[PDB]
Amino acid sequence: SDQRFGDLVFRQLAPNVWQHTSFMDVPGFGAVSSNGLIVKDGERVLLVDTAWTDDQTSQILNWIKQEINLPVALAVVTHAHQDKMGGMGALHAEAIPTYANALSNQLAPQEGMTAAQHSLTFAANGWVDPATAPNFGPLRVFYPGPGHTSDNITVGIDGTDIAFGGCLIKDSKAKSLGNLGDADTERYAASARAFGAAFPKANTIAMSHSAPDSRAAITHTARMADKLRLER
């Protein structure tokens, strides 16, 4: 099912939903992959994350024009890390409206990243403000709280069984919580469970550093963060 296109891999998770995977050689971590989503919303395309680099992101757009042949109406990025906003200049070069958490845009220059042109705000219940996320269609953006970072957001797709956890959620067989450098060890547990409650009917949990998994990935991440909470 994994379709190869250039330096990336593409997999169809559902009708109108695809997963794009880019690879990067972290020096002390081997060849680490990162996943994003491509959503066909009627006559337009919605992108849920970029690749590691500008070059890999332009390969994503070339795949969209090749396979779907529809304009990319908007692009959301889940937090300010290389695997998520590394291809921001590639999306801005094609005049694609980019959206991110307001904190992610404040943090992007601190890590050498191009901030998104629009900033998302959120209500007290973690859901995105409709004034900041216009015409998102099926995209349901949810802020579960500080976890993997302090700005990580999640996205769900209506009409589908799919909810995207980004780097907050790891697969049910993960032996660790991944990159904990920018993590909130206290709220990670409650944030992982908040993401599971925001999308209760989503049994296909997609994430950045793992293949799509069931909802056991949510509880396994929460239990892992439960022990991380008491170790700090």
Ligand SMILES: [Zn+2]
């Ligand atoms: Zn990250």
Ligand SMILES: [Zn+2]
């Ligand atoms: Zn990541």
